[PDB]
Design a protein around this nucleic acid. Structure first.
Ligand code: MG
Lengths: 732, 51
RNA sequence: AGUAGUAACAAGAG
RNA sequence: CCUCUGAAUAAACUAUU
RNA sequence: AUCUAUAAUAGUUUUU
C-alpha cells in the first residue's frame, strides 16, 4: 500500500489543511555568489517592457533615459509600461470624488508631520548605501559621514535638527561645483575631490544585491538599497501615502495581523450584503506581473501633483522631489563575476566596473548577451534605469493607485449593470464582481483588465483565478467563509532565539502562548511544544538537569550547585533546575514563577547587582539596587542576562579604526548622561553643542544647590572656576 | 568501541560496488585507517572526547 | 571527487 | 614558519520590553 | 463608549 499524503485532501478541504502544503521544516534557499547577473537581467527586462518609449539624454548626468509615458496602447497581453497620464489623473479625480476631502486632510496631516519630523528619523533602518564609500554602511554611520562631509563643505542647515533642513542641505549640495571627502587605505587619511557630475551620479545611485532565504521561489532575484540623499523625500512621500491609505476601506495597508483580518472580513461581508439577491457574484484571486518594473516614477509625480493641489508651494516641492530623484536613478551592478582556469587551476575576481570595456570571450552565451544589451546604459560604474520602481519602495502609493482602479468599479462610473470592488495591498488584490449573468461577469472582468492596462497595471493571467464568492486568497491569508489558521507559517519562530538564557526562555514560552491564542495550537500540542523547547534549550545552553550524567564542560559546576542547594524547584533551568511550566502559567516569567522556592543565598547570588555579567551605573558610585543592563523579552535581569561577543572581521580591514571612534563617542555620551539624567529615558532635542549645554546645566545646578543650601560656597566657587576654564578651553 | 566489539564476523574488506568517478582504493584505505585508529585509541588506557 | 545550481565552496588575508 | 578572521536589503505588521 | 504614543530587538508577508 503506497502512502500518498496528498490523498488526505479527498476528505479534508484544502484550506482546512493548508498548513500541510508549506514545507517550512527544511532550510530555505540561499544565493551563493554574485548578484550582477540578476541586476543586469532586471535592468534589461525593465527597459524591454518600455522599449517603444522615447529615448533622451539627461543633460545633468548624461545617462540615456527611456520614457514610456503616453506611449502606444498595447495590442496584446504582454506586460507593458505605457501608462496614460490622463487616465491616471482621471482615476485620482474620481477617487477624490468618491471620498470628498481625503486629499485635503491627508495633506494637512502630512504638513504637520513634515514640519515636526526630526533628522534622527533617518537613523532608523539596517543598512544604507553610503555615497562617500561606494558600499553599504549602518544607517547611523552613513548619516554621520554625510553630515560630516556636508559640514566640511559648508552645508550646516542640518544643525537645526529638522529633517527638512537636511533636505535643504541635500538640494544645496546638488549645486556645489565640487565636493571633498576623505578616504582610508593601508589607516591613513587622503582627500578626494568629486566634480559636479560625479557627485550627482553618486547621489542618485541605489545599491543592488541578491536576496537570501526566501520561501516558495525556485530562482533568485535582486533587491535594492537606497542612498542617503533620497531617504528623507521617500519618507515624506510615504507618510502622505499612509495618511491617504488610512482613509480607504479597500486598502490592505498599513494594517496587519488580527486587525487586518477583521478589516478584510468586514469589507468582504459588506460587499456581500450590498450585492443584490438576484445577481451573480464572483471573486478573483489575482496577482500583478512585474508590478514594480512597470510602475513609472513620472506617474507617481503626476499623482502627487494632483493630490497636493491648493497647497503651499514648499509642501508641493518637498513632496515632488522624490519622484524627480527616482526617475533619474542609477543602479549599481554588484560585486562582478569570478573566472576560473582549469588547466592552471586558479580563480580570480572581475569587478563590475570593468564590464564596460571587458572582452566578451570569458563569458558564456547568456552573460555575454546581458552585457551586450546593457552596455549602452553603463555610466561611471552604474547602469541608467529611468523606468520602474526598483524593489519594495512606494508600496503605499502603489496601494493608492490600485485602490483608485478598484474605486472605478462603482455603478456611477461603469454606467452598466455590472460593477466591482475588492481589496488591494501594494500589488496583490482580490476582486469581487457582481453582474446579472455570466456575460456581465465576463464584461466586468474585461473592463477591469483593460482599465488596469491603461494605468500600466498588468494582471497575471497564469497566477490569477476566479470562482464564486465565498473563498479566496489574499496576501497569503486563505479565506474559506472566514480566514483559516495556518500554523506552518509561524513554525520557524519556534526554537531558541539566541539572545541569552533568560530572553530565550521568555521568547519560547511566549511564542507557545501566542500561537495557542492565534494559530489554533491545541493544549496537548502546546505541552509537547513546551517539552521540545525545553529540550532544545538545555542542549543549546549546556544546562541539563543537575541530577543527570550528561558530559559537558558546564556539568561540573551545575552538579556542585545542585548538590549544595536545598530547594531544587527554585533553581532555574539555566542552573540545572526542573521545568515548572504548564498551560496555566505560560504568561509568567520564570524567575517570578519560582521566586517563592529559591534559597536565600542562591536568590541573592542570582539577583546581585554587582555581577560583572551586567554593566553598572555610576550615580553616586554604583546603583546597587537591581541588576540593570534594551530589555526585550527579559522582564527581570539576572546573571543569565549576559551579552555574547561581537564579530571581529573589521579588525582585518582599513575601517578598524572606526571602532576607536565609536568607543570614543560612547565615552562622550556617557558624560552627557551625568548632566541630563533623562537623556537615556527620552531622546534630548537641542541645537547647542554638547559642551555648551553641559556647562550651562552645571552652572544652573550649582546656583540652585547653593541657593537651596545643598552645597557650600567653596564648592560653588570651584564649580564656577572650572566652568570658566572649560570656556577658555572651548576657544583653544 | 563497545558496539563494534559486539559483532563477530569481520572479513577482509573488498570493493563490491565501485564509485565510477572516485578512487575506490582511497575509500578502502580510509576504512582501514578508521579501524587502525580505533584500535590505537583503545590501546592508550584512556578514551578522549575527540580523536 | 563532493556539496551545490544560473554561482559559488572545495580556506582568505597580512 | 608565524599573526589575525569566520560576515548587518526596503515597507508594513506581529511579540516583548 | 473610544483607542495608530514613542525607541530597541527578533519573526512573518510582499516570482518574467
Ligand atoms: Mg495575490
Amino acid at each position: 500500500m503506497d502512502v500518498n499524503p496528498t490523498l488526505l485532501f479527498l476528505k479534508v478541504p484544502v484550506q482546512n489543511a493548508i498548513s500541510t502544503t508549506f514545507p517550512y521544516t527544511g532550510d530555505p534557499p540561499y544565493s551563493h555568489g554574485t548578484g550582477t547577473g540578476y541586476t543586469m537581467d532586471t535592468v534589461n527586462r525593465t527597459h524591454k517592457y518600455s522599449e517603444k518609449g522615447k529615448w533622451t539624454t539627461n543633460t545633468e548626468t548624461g545617462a540615456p533615459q527611456l520614457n514610456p509615458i503616453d506611449g502606444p496602447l498595447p495590442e496584446d497581453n504582454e506586460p507593458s509600461g505605457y501608462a496614460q497620464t490622463d487616465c491616471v489623473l482621471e482615476a485620482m479625480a474620481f477617487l477624490e470624488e468618491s471620498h470628498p476631502g481625503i486629499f485635503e486632510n491627508s495633506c494637512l496631516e502630512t504638513m504637520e508631520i513634515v514640519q515636526q519630523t526630526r533628522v534622527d528619523k533617518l537613523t532608523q533602518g539596517r543598512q544604507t548605501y553610503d555615497w562617500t564609500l561606494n558600499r553599504n554602511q549602518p544607517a547611523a554611520t552613513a548619516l554621520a559621514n554625510t553630515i560630516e562631509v556636508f559640514r566640511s563643505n559648508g552645508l550646516t542647515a542640518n544643525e537645526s535638527g529638522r529633517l527638512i533642513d537636511f533636505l535643504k542641505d541635500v538640494m544645496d549640495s546638488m549645486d556645489k561645483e565640487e565636493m571633498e571627502i576623505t578616504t582610508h587605505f593601508q589607516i591613513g587619511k587622503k582627500k578626494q575631490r568629486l566634480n559636479k557630475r560625479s557627485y550627482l551620479i553618486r547621489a542618485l545611485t541605489l545599491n543592488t544585491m541578491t536576496k537570501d532565504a526566501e520561501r516558495g521561489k525556485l530562482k533568485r532575484r535582486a533587491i535594492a538599497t537606497p542612498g542617503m540623499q533620497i531617504r528623507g523625500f521617500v519618507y515624506f512621500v510615504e507618510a502622505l501615502a499612509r495618511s491617504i491609505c488610512e482613509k480607504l476601506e479597500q486598502s490592505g495597508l498599513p494594517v496587519g495581523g488580527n486587525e487586518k483580518k477583521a478589516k478584510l472580513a468586514n469589507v468582504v461581508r459588506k460587499m456581500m450584503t450590498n450585492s443584490q439577491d438576484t445577481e451573480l457574484s464572483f471573486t478573483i484571486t489575482g496577482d500583478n506581473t512585474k508590478w514594480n518594473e512597470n510602475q513609472n516614477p513620472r506617474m507617481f509625480l503626476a499623482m502627487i501633483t494632483y493630490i497636493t493641489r491648493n497647497q503651499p508651494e514648499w509642501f508641493r516641492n518637498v513632496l515632488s522631489i522624490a519622484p524627480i530623484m527616482f526617475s533619474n536613478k542609477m543602479a549599481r551592478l554588484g560585486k562582478g563575476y569570478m573566472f576560473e582556469s582549469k588547466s592552471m587551476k586558479l580563480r580570480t575576481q572581475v569587478p563590475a566596473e570593468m564590464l564596460a570595456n571587458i572582452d566578451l570571450k570569458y563569458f558564456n552565451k547568456s552573460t555575454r548577451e546581458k552585457i551586450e544589451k546593457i552596455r549602452p546604459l553603463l555610466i561611471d560604474g552604474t547602469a541608467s534605469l529611468s523606468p520602474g520602481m526598483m524593489m519594495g519602495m512606494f508600496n503605499m502609493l502603489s496601494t493608492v493607485l490600485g485602490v483608485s482602479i478598484l474605486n472605478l468599479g462603482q455603478k456611477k462610473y461603469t454606467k452598466t449593470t455590472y460593477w466591482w470592488d475588492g481589496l488591494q495591498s501594494s500589488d496583490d488584490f482580490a476582486l469581487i464582481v457582481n453582474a446579472p449573468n455570466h456575460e456581465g461577469i465576463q464584461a466586468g472582468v474585461d473592463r477591469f483588465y483593460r482599465t488596469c492596462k491603461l494605468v500600466g497595471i498588468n494582471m497575471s493571467k497564469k497566477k490569477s483565478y476566479i470562482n464564486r464568492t465565498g473563498t479566496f486568497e489574499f496576501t497569503s491569508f486563505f479565506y474559506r467563509y472566514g480566514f483559516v489558521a495556518n500554523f506552518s507559517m509561524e513554525l520557524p519562530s519556534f526554537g531558541v532565539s539566541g539572545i541569552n538564557e533568560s530572553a530565550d526562555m521568555s521568547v519560547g514560552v511566549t511564542v507557545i502562548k501566542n500561537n495557542m491564542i492565534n494559530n489554533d495550537l491545541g493544549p496537548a500540542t502546546a505541552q509537547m511544544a513546551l517539552q521540545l523547547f525545553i529540550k532544545d534549550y538545555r542542549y543549546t545552553y549546556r544546562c541539563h538537569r543537575g541530577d543527570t550524567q550528561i558530559q559537558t564542560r558546564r556539568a561540573f559546576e551545575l552538579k556542585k550547585l545542585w548538590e549544595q542547594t536545598r530547594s531544587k524547584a527554585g533553581l532555574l533551568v539555566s542552573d540545572g533546575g526542573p521545568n515548572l511550566y504548564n498551560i496555566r502559567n505560560l504568561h509568567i516569567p520564570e524567575v517570578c514563577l519560582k521566586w517563592e522556592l529559591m534559597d536565600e543565598d542562591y536568590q541573592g547570588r542570582l539577583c546581585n547587582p554587582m555581577n560583572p555579567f551586567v554593566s553598572h551605573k555610576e550615580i553616586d558610585s554604583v546603583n546597587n539596587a537591581v541588576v540593570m543592563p534594551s530589555m526585550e523579552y527579559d522582564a527581570v535581569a539576572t546573571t543569565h542576562s549576559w551579552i555574547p561577543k561581537r564579530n571581529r572581521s573589521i579588525l582585518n580591514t582599513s575601517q578598524r579604526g572606526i571602532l576607536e571612534d565609536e568607543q570614543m563617542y560612547q565615552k562622550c555620551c556617557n558624560l552627557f548622561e551625568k548632566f541630563f539624567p533623562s537623556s537615556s529615558y527620552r531622546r534630548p532635542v537641542g541645537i547647542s553643542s554638547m559642551v555648551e549645554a553641559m556647562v550651562s546645566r552645571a552652572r544652573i545646578d550649582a546656583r540652585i544647590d547653593f541657593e537651596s543650601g545643598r552645597i557650600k560656597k567653596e564648592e560653588f566657587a570651584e564649580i564656577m572656576k572650572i566652568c570658566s576654564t572649560i570656556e577658555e578651553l572651548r576657544r583653544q | 568501541i563497545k558496539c563494534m566489539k559486539t559483532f563477530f564476523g569481520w572479513k577482509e574488506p573488498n570493493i563490491i560496488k565501485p564509485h565510477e568517478k572516485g578512487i575506490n582504493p582511497n575509500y578502502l584505505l580510509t576504512w582501514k585507517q578508521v579501524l587502525a585508529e580505533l584500535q590505537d585509541i583503545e590501546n592508550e588506557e584512556k578514551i578522549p572526547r575527540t580523536k
